[PDB]
């Protein structure tokens, strides 16, 4: 889809793609996420981050940290070049960024920083 994606984290701590393929062409990316299932924010909260892959643990251990009412991110963290805020079961949220964050020959992954669920919730972004 022309610059987009949408993306689904179910009430089994599960997204419906690990691999998200981001056009050069695009000037900017969107994710848009949602939640199926009936299971509240607090118990099973997903959020979709973006960081290098080396960035990856730092980010979930501080979010972790950082608590749900900061929706498990540290406040202005450089590493994270984007995010959605946390959703229930029901909500939705967007994320938009710039695709000249990205270059070539770095490697990008996506994840949630619920606790916990990185284990299960994450893949890969390639810029292509
Ligand atoms: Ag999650």
Known sequence: AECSVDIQGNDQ???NTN???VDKSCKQFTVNLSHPGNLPKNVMGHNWVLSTAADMQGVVTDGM????DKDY???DDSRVIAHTKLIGSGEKDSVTF???KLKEGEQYMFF???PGHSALMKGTLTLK
């Open 65 to 68: 940290a950082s608590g749900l």
């Open 73 to 75: 991110l540290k406040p």
């Open 19 to 21: 691999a998200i393929t």
């Open 112 to 114: 949630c920083t619920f």
């Open 98 to 100: 710039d695709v000249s």
């Open 13 to 15: 701590m599960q997204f």
